[PDB]
Short mmCIF file of C-alpha atoms and ligand atoms in Angstrom, two decimals:
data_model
loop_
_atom_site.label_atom_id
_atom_site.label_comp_id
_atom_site.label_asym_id
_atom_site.label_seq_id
_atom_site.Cartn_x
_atom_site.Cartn_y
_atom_site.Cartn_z
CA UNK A 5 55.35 -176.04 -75.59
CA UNK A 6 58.39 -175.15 -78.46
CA UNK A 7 60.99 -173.37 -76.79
CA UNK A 8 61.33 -171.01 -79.70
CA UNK A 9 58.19 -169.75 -79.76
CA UNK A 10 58.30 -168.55 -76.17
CA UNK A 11 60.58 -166.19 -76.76
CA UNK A 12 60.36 -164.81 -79.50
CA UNK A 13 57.00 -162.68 -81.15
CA UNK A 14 54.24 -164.13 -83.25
CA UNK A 15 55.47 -162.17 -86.35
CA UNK A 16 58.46 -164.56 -86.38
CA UNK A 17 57.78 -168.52 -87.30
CA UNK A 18 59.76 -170.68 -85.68
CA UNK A 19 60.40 -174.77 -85.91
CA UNK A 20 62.38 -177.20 -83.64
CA UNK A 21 63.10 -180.76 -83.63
CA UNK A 22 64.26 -182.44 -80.74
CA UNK A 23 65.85 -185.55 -82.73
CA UNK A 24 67.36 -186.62 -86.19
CA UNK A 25 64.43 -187.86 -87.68
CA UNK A 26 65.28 -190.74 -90.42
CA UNK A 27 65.74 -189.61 -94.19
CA UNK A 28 66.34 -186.08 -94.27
CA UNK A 29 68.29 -184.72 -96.72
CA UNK A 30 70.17 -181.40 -97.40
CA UNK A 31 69.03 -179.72 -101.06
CA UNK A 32 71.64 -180.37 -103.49
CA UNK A 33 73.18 -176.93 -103.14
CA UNK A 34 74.09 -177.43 -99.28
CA UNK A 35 75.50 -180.94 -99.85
CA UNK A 36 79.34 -179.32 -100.69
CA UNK A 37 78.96 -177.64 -97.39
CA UNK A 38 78.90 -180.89 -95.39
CA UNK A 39 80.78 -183.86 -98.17
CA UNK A 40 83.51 -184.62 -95.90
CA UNK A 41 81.85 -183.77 -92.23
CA UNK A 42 81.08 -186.33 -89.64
CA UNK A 43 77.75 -187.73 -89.04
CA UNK A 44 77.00 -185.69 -86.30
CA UNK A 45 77.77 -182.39 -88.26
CA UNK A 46 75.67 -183.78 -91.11
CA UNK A 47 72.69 -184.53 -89.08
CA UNK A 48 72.81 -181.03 -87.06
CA UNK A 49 73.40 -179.28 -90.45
CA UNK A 50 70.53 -181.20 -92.29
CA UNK A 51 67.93 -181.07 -89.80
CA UNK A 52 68.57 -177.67 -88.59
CA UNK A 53 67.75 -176.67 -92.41
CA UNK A 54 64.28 -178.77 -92.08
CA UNK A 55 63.37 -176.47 -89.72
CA UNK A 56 64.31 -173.34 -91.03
CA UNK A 57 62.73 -174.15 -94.16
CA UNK A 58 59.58 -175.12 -92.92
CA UNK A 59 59.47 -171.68 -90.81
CA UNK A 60 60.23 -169.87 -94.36
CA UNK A 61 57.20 -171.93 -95.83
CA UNK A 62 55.43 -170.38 -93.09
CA UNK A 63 56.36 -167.00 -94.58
CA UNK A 64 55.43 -167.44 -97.75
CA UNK A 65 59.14 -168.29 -99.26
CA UNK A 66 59.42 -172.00 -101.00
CA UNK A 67 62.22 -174.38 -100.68
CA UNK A 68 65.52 -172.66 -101.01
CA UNK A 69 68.76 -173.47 -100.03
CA UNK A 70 70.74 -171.64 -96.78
CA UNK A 71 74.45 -171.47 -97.74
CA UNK A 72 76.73 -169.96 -95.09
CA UNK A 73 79.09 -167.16 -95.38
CA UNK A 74 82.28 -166.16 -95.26
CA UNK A 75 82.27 -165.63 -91.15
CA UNK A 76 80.02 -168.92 -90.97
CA UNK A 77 76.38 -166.81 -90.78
CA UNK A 78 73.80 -168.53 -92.80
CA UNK A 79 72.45 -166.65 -96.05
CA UNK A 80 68.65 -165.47 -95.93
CA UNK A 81 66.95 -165.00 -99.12
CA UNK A 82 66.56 -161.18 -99.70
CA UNK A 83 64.06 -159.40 -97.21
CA UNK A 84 64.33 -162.18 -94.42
CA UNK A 85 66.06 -162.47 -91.45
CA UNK A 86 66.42 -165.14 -89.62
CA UNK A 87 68.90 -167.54 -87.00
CA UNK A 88 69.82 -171.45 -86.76
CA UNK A 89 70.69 -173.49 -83.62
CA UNK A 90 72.18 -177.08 -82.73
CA UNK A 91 73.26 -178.62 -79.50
CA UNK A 92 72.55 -182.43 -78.48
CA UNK A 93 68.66 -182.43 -77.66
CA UNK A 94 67.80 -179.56 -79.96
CA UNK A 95 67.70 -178.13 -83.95
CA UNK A 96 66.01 -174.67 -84.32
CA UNK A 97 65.72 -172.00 -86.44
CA UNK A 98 63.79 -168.33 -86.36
CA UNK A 99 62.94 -166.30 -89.47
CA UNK A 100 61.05 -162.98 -89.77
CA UNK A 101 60.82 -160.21 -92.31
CA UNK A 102 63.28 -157.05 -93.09
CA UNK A 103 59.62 -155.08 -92.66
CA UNK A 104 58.28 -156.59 -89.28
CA UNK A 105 61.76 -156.91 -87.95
CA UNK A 106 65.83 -155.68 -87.83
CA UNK A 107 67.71 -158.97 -86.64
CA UNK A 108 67.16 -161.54 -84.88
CA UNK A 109 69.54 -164.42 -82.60
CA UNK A 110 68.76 -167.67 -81.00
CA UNK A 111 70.88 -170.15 -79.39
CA UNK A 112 70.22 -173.42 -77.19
CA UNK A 113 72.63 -175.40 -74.84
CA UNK A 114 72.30 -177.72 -72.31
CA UNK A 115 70.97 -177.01 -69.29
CA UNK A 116 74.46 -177.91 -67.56
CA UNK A 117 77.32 -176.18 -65.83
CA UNK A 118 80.01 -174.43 -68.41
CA UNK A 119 82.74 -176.83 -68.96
CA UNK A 120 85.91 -176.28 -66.96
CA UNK A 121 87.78 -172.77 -67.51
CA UNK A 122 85.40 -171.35 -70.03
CA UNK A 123 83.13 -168.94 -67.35
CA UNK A 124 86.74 -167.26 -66.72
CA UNK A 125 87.38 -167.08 -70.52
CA UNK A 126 83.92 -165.66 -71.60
CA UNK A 127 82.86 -163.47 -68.41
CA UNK A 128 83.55 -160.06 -67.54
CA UNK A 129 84.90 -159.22 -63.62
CA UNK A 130 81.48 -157.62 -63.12
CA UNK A 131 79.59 -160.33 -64.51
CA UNK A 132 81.24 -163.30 -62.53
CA UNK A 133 80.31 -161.19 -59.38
CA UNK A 134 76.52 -160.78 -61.20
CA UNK A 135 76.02 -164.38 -61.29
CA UNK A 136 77.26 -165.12 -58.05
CA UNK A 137 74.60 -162.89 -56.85
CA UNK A 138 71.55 -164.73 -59.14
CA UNK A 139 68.96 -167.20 -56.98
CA UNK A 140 70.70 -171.02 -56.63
CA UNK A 141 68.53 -173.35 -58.70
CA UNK A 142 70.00 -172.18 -62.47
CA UNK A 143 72.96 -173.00 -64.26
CA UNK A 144 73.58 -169.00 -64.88
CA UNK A 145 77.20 -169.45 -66.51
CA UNK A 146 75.89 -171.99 -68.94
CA UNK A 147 72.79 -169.10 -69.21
CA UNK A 148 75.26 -166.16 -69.64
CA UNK A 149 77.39 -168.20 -72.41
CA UNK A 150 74.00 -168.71 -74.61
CA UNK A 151 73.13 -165.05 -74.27
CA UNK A 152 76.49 -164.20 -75.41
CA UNK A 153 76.17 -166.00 -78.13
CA UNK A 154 72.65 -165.06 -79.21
CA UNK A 155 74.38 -161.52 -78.64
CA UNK A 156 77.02 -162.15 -81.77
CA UNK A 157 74.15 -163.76 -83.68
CA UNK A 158 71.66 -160.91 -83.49
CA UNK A 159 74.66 -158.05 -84.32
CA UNK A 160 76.57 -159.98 -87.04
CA UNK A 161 73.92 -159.57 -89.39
CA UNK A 162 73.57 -155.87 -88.50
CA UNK A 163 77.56 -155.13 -88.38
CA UNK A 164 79.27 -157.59 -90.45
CA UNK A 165 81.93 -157.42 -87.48
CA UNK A 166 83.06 -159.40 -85.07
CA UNK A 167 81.58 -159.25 -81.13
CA UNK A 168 83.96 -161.01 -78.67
CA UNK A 169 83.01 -162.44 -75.40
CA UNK A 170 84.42 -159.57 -73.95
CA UNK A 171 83.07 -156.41 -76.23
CA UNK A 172 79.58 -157.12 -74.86
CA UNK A 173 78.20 -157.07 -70.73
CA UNK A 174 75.49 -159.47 -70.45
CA UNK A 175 72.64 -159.28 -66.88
CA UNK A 176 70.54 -161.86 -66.89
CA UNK A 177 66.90 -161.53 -64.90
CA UNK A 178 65.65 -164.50 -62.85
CA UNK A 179 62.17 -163.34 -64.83
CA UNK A 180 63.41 -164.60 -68.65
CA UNK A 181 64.47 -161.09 -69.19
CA UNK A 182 68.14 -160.31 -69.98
CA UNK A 183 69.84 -157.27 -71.76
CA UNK A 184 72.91 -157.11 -73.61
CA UNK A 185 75.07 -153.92 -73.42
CA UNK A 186 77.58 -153.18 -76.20
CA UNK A 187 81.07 -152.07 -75.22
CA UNK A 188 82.76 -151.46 -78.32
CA UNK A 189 81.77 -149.03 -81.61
CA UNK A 190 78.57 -149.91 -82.26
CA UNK A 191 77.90 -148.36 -85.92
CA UNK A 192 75.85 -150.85 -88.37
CA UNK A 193 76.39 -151.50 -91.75
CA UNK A 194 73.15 -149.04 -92.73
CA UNK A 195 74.63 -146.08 -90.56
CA UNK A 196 72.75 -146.80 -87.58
CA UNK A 197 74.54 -147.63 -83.79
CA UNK A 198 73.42 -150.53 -81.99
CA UNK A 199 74.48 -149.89 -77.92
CA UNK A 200 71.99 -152.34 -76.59
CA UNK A 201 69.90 -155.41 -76.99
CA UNK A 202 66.88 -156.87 -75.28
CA UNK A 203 66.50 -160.63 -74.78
CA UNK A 204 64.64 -163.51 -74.04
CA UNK A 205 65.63 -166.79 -72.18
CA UNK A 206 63.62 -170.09 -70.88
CA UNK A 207 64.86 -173.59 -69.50
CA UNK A 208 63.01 -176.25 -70.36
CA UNK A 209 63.27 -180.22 -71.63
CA UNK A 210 67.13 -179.95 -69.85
CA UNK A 211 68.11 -177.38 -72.34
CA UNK A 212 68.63 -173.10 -72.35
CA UNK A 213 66.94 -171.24 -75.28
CA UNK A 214 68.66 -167.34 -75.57
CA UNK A 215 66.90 -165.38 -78.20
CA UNK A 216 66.76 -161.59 -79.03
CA UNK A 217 65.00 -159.47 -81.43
CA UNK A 218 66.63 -156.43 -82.40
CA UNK A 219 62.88 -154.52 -83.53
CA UNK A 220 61.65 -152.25 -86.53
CA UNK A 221 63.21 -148.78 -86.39
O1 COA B 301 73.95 -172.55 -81.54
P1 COA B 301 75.02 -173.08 -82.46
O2 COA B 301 76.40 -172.64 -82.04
O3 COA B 301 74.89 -174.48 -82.88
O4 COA B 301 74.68 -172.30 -84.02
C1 COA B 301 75.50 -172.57 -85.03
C2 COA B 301 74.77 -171.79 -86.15
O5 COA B 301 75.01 -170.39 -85.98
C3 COA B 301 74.86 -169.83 -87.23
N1 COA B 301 76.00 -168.85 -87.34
C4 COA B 301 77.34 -169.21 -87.56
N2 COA B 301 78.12 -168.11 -87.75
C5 COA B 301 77.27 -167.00 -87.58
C6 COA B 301 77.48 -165.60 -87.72
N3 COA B 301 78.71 -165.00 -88.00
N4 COA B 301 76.40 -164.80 -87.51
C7 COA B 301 75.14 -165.34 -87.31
N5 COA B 301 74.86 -166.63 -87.18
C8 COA B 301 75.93 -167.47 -87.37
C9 COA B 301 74.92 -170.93 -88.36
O6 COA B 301 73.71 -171.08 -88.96
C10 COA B 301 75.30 -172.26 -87.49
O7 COA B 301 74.71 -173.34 -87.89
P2 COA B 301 75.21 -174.03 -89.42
O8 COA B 301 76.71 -174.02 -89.43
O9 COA B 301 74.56 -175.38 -89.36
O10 COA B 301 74.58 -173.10 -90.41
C1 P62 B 302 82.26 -171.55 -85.00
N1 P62 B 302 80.93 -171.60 -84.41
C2 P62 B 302 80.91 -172.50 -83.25
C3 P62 B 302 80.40 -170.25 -84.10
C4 P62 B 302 81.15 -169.53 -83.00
N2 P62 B 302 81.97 -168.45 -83.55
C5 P62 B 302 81.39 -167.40 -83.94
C6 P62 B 302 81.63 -166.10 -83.36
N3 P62 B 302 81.94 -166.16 -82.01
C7 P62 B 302 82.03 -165.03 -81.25
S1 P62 B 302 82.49 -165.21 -79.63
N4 P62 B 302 81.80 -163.81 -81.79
C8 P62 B 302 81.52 -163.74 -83.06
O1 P62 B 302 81.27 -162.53 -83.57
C9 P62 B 302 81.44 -164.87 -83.97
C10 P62 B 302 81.16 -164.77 -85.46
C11 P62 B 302 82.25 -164.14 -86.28
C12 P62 B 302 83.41 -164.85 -86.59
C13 P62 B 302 84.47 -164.23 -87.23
C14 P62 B 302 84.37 -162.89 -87.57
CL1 P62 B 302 85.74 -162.08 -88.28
C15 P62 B 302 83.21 -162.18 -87.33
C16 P62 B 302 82.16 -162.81 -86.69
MN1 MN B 303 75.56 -176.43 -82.75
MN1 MN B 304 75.50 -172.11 -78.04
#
Protein backbone atom coordinates (compact mmCIF):
# COMPACT_ATOMS: atom_id res chain seq x y z
CA UNK A 1 0.00 0.00 0.00
CA UNK A 2 3.01 2.86 1.05
CA UNK A 3 4.33 4.20 -1.97
CA UNK A 4 7.82 4.05 -0.57
CA UNK A 5 8.03 0.72 0.02
CA UNK A 6 7.24 -0.26 -3.55
CA UNK A 7 10.10 0.95 -4.77
CA UNK A 8 12.54 0.64 -2.94
CA UNK A 9 14.20 -2.96 -1.27
CA UNK A 10 13.31 -4.52 2.03
CA UNK A 11 16.81 -3.68 3.45
CA UNK A 12 15.68 -0.03 3.44
CA UNK A 13 12.70 1.10 6.06
CA UNK A 14 10.67 3.49 4.90
CA UNK A 15 7.60 5.74 6.55
CA UNK A 16 5.01 8.13 4.93
CA UNK A 17 2.28 10.20 6.14
CA UNK A 18 -0.23 11.45 3.98
CA UNK A 19 -1.34 14.46 6.40
CA UNK A 20 -0.08 16.82 9.26
CA UNK A 21 -1.15 14.91 12.01
CA UNK A 22 -1.90 17.29 15.22
CA UNK A 23 1.04 17.88 17.81
CA UNK A 24 4.14 17.01 16.24
CA UNK A 25 7.03 18.63 17.11
CA UNK A 26 10.61 19.10 15.71
CA UNK A 27 13.51 18.00 18.52
CA UNK A 28 14.91 21.02 19.96
CA UNK A 29 17.97 20.96 17.75
CA UNK A 30 15.88 21.35 14.37
CA UNK A 31 13.67 24.13 15.81
CA UNK A 32 16.47 27.07 14.57
CA UNK A 33 16.09 25.51 11.21
CA UNK A 34 12.41 26.43 10.85
CA UNK A 35 11.88 29.78 13.79
CA UNK A 36 10.86 32.17 11.24
CA UNK A 37 9.26 29.72 8.35
CA UNK A 38 5.66 29.63 7.45
CA UNK A 39 3.29 27.09 8.63
CA UNK A 40 3.39 25.15 5.73
CA UNK A 41 7.28 24.84 5.79
CA UNK A 42 7.00 23.97 9.48
CA UNK A 43 4.55 21.25 9.06
CA UNK A 44 6.44 19.62 5.89
CA UNK A 45 9.74 20.02 7.86
CA UNK A 46 8.30 18.51 11.17
CA UNK A 47 6.45 15.70 9.87
CA UNK A 48 8.80 14.70 7.24
CA UNK A 49 11.31 14.20 10.36
CA UNK A 50 8.48 11.86 12.10
CA UNK A 51 8.93 9.73 9.47
CA UNK A 52 12.41 9.53 8.99
CA UNK A 53 12.88 8.95 12.51
CA UNK A 54 10.61 6.30 12.91
CA UNK A 55 12.34 4.47 9.76
CA UNK A 56 15.82 5.01 11.78
CA UNK A 57 14.04 3.35 14.89
CA UNK A 58 13.44 0.68 12.53
CA UNK A 59 17.22 0.42 12.10
CA UNK A 60 18.20 0.28 15.29
CA UNK A 61 19.27 4.20 15.67
CA UNK A 62 17.18 6.24 18.55
CA UNK A 63 15.83 9.66 18.31
CA UNK A 64 18.31 12.00 16.79
CA UNK A 65 18.04 15.07 15.18
CA UNK A 66 18.46 15.60 11.02
CA UNK A 67 20.09 19.02 10.51
CA UNK A 68 20.62 20.04 6.88
CA UNK A 69 23.71 21.09 5.19
CA UNK A 70 25.35 23.54 3.62
CA UNK A 71 23.72 22.64 -0.09
CA UNK A 72 20.32 21.90 1.85
CA UNK A 73 20.96 17.75 2.06
CA UNK A 74 19.85 16.44 5.34
CA UNK A 75 22.65 15.01 7.79
CA UNK A 76 22.52 11.10 8.49
CA UNK A 77 24.04 9.90 11.58
CA UNK A 78 27.36 8.11 10.65
CA UNK A 79 26.88 4.73 8.65
CA UNK A 80 23.28 5.63 7.32
CA UNK A 81 22.02 6.82 4.33
CA UNK A 82 19.02 7.91 3.75
CA UNK A 83 16.41 10.67 1.66
CA UNK A 84 13.33 13.04 2.74
CA UNK A 85 10.32 14.12 0.61
CA UNK A 86 7.34 16.75 0.81
CA UNK A 87 4.74 17.81 -1.66
CA UNK A 88 0.91 18.54 -0.74
CA UNK A 89 -0.57 14.90 -0.13
CA UNK A 90 2.71 13.35 0.95
CA UNK A 91 5.86 13.34 3.79
CA UNK A 92 8.42 10.50 3.27
CA UNK A 93 11.60 9.51 4.08
CA UNK A 94 14.04 6.29 3.16
CA UNK A 95 17.03 5.22 5.26
CA UNK A 96 19.39 2.23 4.81
CA UNK A 97 22.87 1.33 5.92
CA UNK A 98 26.54 2.40 4.46
CA UNK A 99 26.93 -1.75 4.52
CA UNK A 100 23.63 -2.92 2.73
CA UNK A 101 23.66 0.13 0.55
CA UNK A 102 25.71 3.29 -1.42
CA UNK A 103 22.93 6.10 -1.73
CA UNK A 104 19.79 6.35 -1.99
CA UNK A 105 16.94 9.27 -3.56
CA UNK A 106 13.25 9.61 -3.33
CA UNK A 107 10.99 12.25 -4.40
CA UNK A 108 7.02 12.60 -4.72
CA UNK A 109 4.88 15.18 -6.72
CA UNK A 110 1.61 15.41 -7.81
CA UNK A 111 0.31 13.42 -10.22
CA UNK A 112 -0.33 16.64 -12.49
CA UNK A 113 1.00 18.24 -15.63
CA UNK A 114 4.47 20.38 -15.06
CA UNK A 115 3.53 23.90 -14.54
CA UNK A 116 3.84 26.20 -17.52
CA UNK A 117 7.51 26.57 -19.11
CA UNK A 118 9.29 24.28 -16.75
CA UNK A 119 9.29 20.82 -19.24
CA UNK A 120 11.35 23.29 -21.68
CA UNK A 121 13.57 24.42 -18.74
CA UNK A 122 14.33 20.91 -17.23
CA UNK A 123 14.25 18.55 -20.48
CA UNK A 124 16.79 17.66 -22.83
CA UNK A 125 15.88 17.90 -26.96
CA UNK A 126 16.01 14.08 -26.88
CA UNK A 127 13.96 13.70 -23.97
CA UNK A 128 10.99 16.06 -24.99
CA UNK A 129 10.89 13.85 -28.22
CA UNK A 130 11.10 10.57 -25.56
CA UNK A 131 8.04 11.58 -23.85
CA UNK A 132 6.16 12.46 -26.72
CA UNK A 133 6.66 8.97 -27.75
CA UNK A 134 5.46 7.34 -24.03
CA UNK A 135 1.64 5.64 -23.99
CA UNK A 136 -1.20 8.69 -23.32
CA UNK A 137 -2.66 8.01 -19.87
CA UNK A 138 0.59 9.48 -17.64
CA UNK A 139 1.63 12.78 -16.79
CA UNK A 140 5.39 11.83 -18.10
CA UNK A 141 6.83 15.54 -17.75
CA UNK A 142 5.61 15.78 -14.22
CA UNK A 143 7.27 11.87 -14.11
CA UNK A 144 10.57 12.99 -15.78
CA UNK A 145 10.87 16.18 -13.32
CA UNK A 146 10.62 13.69 -10.10
CA UNK A 147 13.22 11.38 -11.58
CA UNK A 148 15.41 14.26 -12.09
CA UNK A 149 15.21 15.15 -8.94
CA UNK A 150 15.56 11.77 -7.22
CA UNK A 151 18.66 11.81 -9.73
CA UNK A 152 20.43 14.97 -7.71
CA UNK A 153 19.28 13.34 -4.46
CA UNK A 154 20.84 9.93 -4.94
CA UNK A 155 24.43 11.62 -6.42
CA UNK A 156 24.73 14.55 -3.97
CA UNK A 157 25.52 12.39 -1.24
CA UNK A 158 28.02 10.45 -3.38
CA UNK A 159 29.65 13.72 -5.13
CA UNK A 160 29.14 16.59 -2.95
CA UNK A 161 28.52 18.43 -6.44
CA UNK A 162 26.00 19.84 -8.06
CA UNK A 163 23.73 17.80 -10.96
CA UNK A 164 21.71 20.25 -13.13
CA UNK A 165 18.64 19.43 -15.01
CA UNK A 166 20.65 19.31 -17.89
CA UNK A 167 24.01 17.20 -16.78
CA UNK A 168 21.79 14.11 -16.48
CA UNK A 169 19.38 12.17 -19.55
CA UNK A 170 16.53 10.64 -17.89
CA UNK A 171 14.11 7.41 -20.04
CA UNK A 172 11.42 6.56 -18.28
CA UNK A 173 9.70 2.82 -18.88
CA UNK A 174 5.89 2.55 -18.99
CA UNK A 175 6.89 -0.73 -16.60
CA UNK A 176 8.11 1.52 -13.26
CA UNK A 177 11.55 1.16 -14.59
CA UNK A 178 13.59 4.28 -15.48
CA UNK A 179 17.44 4.88 -15.77
CA UNK A 180 19.35 7.89 -15.30
CA UNK A 181 22.46 8.53 -17.48
CA UNK A 182 25.15 10.95 -16.27
CA UNK A 183 26.52 13.48 -18.73
CA UNK A 184 29.04 15.27 -16.91
CA UNK A 185 32.41 13.95 -14.77
CA UNK A 186 31.14 11.52 -12.79
CA UNK A 187 34.07 10.91 -10.09
CA UNK A 188 32.69 10.46 -6.30
CA UNK A 189 34.00 11.76 -3.35
CA UNK A 190 35.63 8.02 -2.43
CA UNK A 191 37.37 7.80 -5.97
CA UNK A 192 34.77 5.91 -7.58
CA UNK A 193 32.67 7.23 -11.06
CA UNK A 194 29.09 7.10 -11.03
CA UNK A 195 27.86 7.11 -15.11
CA UNK A 196 24.50 5.64 -14.40
CA UNK A 197 21.61 5.06 -12.11
CA UNK A 198 18.72 2.64 -11.95
CA UNK A 199 15.28 3.72 -10.71
CA UNK A 200 12.05 3.08 -9.54
CA UNK A 201 8.69 4.99 -10.12
CA UNK A 202 4.78 4.28 -9.20
CA UNK A 203 1.55 6.58 -9.37
CA UNK A 204 -0.71 6.12 -6.94
CA UNK A 205 -3.25 8.15 -4.33
CA UNK A 206 -2.87 11.24 -7.26
CA UNK A 207 0.76 11.49 -6.51
CA UNK A 208 4.42 10.25 -8.42
CA UNK A 209 6.95 8.46 -6.13
CA UNK A 210 10.78 8.49 -8.04
CA UNK A 211 13.22 6.55 -6.01
CA UNK A 212 16.71 5.05 -6.80
CA UNK A 213 19.16 3.00 -5.03
CA UNK A 214 22.59 3.41 -5.99
CA UNK A 215 23.70 -0.55 -4.55
CA UNK A 216 26.73 -2.08 -2.52
CA UNK A 217 29.94 -2.09 -4.57
O1 LIG B 1 10.94 16.34 -2.64
P1 LIG B 1 11.26 17.67 -1.99
O2 LIG B 1 11.79 18.66 -3.00
O3 LIG B 1 10.28 18.18 -1.03
O4 LIG B 1 12.59 17.30 -0.87
C1 LIG B 1 13.10 18.32 -0.19
C2 LIG B 1 14.10 17.53 0.69
O5 LIG B 1 15.23 17.16 -0.10
C3 LIG B 1 16.28 17.00 0.78
N1 LIG B 1 17.45 17.65 0.10
C4 LIG B 1 17.63 19.04 -0.02
N2 LIG B 1 18.84 19.33 -0.57
C5 LIG B 1 19.44 18.10 -0.88
C6 LIG B 1 20.71 17.74 -1.41
N3 LIG B 1 21.68 18.66 -1.83
N4 LIG B 1 20.96 16.42 -1.54
C7 LIG B 1 20.08 15.46 -1.07
N5 LIG B 1 18.87 15.71 -0.56
C8 LIG B 1 18.58 17.04 -0.42
C9 LIG B 1 15.96 17.69 2.17
O6 LIG B 1 15.81 16.75 3.15
C10 LIG B 1 14.54 18.42 1.85
O7 LIG B 1 13.69 18.38 2.82
P2 LIG B 1 14.03 19.37 4.24
O8 LIG B 1 14.45 20.72 3.73
O9 LIG B 1 12.71 19.31 4.95
O10 LIG B 1 15.12 18.59 4.91
C1 LIG C 1 15.77 24.00 -2.90
N1 LIG C 1 15.07 22.71 -2.94
C2 LIG C 1 13.75 22.87 -3.54
C3 LIG C 1 15.88 21.64 -3.56
C4 LIG C 1 16.13 21.85 -5.05
N2 LIG C 1 17.51 22.25 -5.30
C5 LIG C 1 18.41 21.36 -5.20
C6 LIG C 1 19.25 20.96 -6.30
N3 LIG C 1 18.61 21.05 -7.52
C7 LIG C 1 19.18 20.55 -8.66
S1 LIG C 1 18.34 20.76 -10.12
N4 LIG C 1 20.39 19.94 -8.62
C8 LIG C 1 21.01 19.87 -7.48
O1 LIG C 1 22.18 19.24 -7.45
C9 LIG C 1 20.51 20.40 -6.21
C10 LIG C 1 21.26 20.35 -4.90
C11 LIG C 1 22.50 21.22 -4.82
C12 LIG C 1 22.39 22.60 -4.66
C13 LIG C 1 23.51 23.41 -4.73
C14 LIG C 1 24.74 22.84 -4.95
CL1 LIG C 1 26.14 23.86 -5.15
C15 LIG C 1 24.89 21.47 -5.06
C16 LIG C 1 23.76 20.67 -4.99
MN1 LIG D 1 8.80 19.54 -0.57
MN1 LIG E 1 9.97 16.98 -6.31
Amino acid sequence: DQLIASVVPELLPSAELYEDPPGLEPLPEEEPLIAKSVAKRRNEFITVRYCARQALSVLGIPEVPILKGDKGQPLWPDGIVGSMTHTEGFRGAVVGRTGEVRSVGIDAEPHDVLPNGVLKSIALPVERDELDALPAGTHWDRLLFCAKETTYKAWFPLTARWLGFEDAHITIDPDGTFTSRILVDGRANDGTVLSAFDGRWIIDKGLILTAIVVPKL
